[PDB]
Amino acid sequence: EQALRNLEDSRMSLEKDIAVKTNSLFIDRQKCMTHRNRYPSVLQLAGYQ
């Protein structure tokens, strides 16, 4: 019985951590996609030079 208790402690902690990590991954990839595809053109950074 005691071993059982240890087992489900393990699995609950594991899966909550997995949820956290999934959230973080989706966050970072979406936000940086959005921002990186914005970057101006080297010609405009020159500024019609």
């Binding site: 208790r5 240890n6 489900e8 402690d9 609950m12 902690s13």
Partner: protein, 45 residues
């Protein structure tokens, strides 16, 4: 220049309060939520 000194005090106070409260939230989360999880049977050794 008088206005500038006033704003200087404002900025300093704000930043220090930021640091303090960040410490508070930090400590509370990773300490309490570490053991206090689901089902009050098994120790957090």
């Amino acid at each position: 220049e008088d206005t500038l000194q006033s704003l200087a005090h404002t900025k300093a106070t704000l930043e220090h309060d930021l640091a303090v409260k960040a410490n508070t939230l930090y400590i509370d989360q990773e300490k309490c939520m570490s053991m206090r999880n689901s089902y009050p049977s098994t120790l957090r050794l």
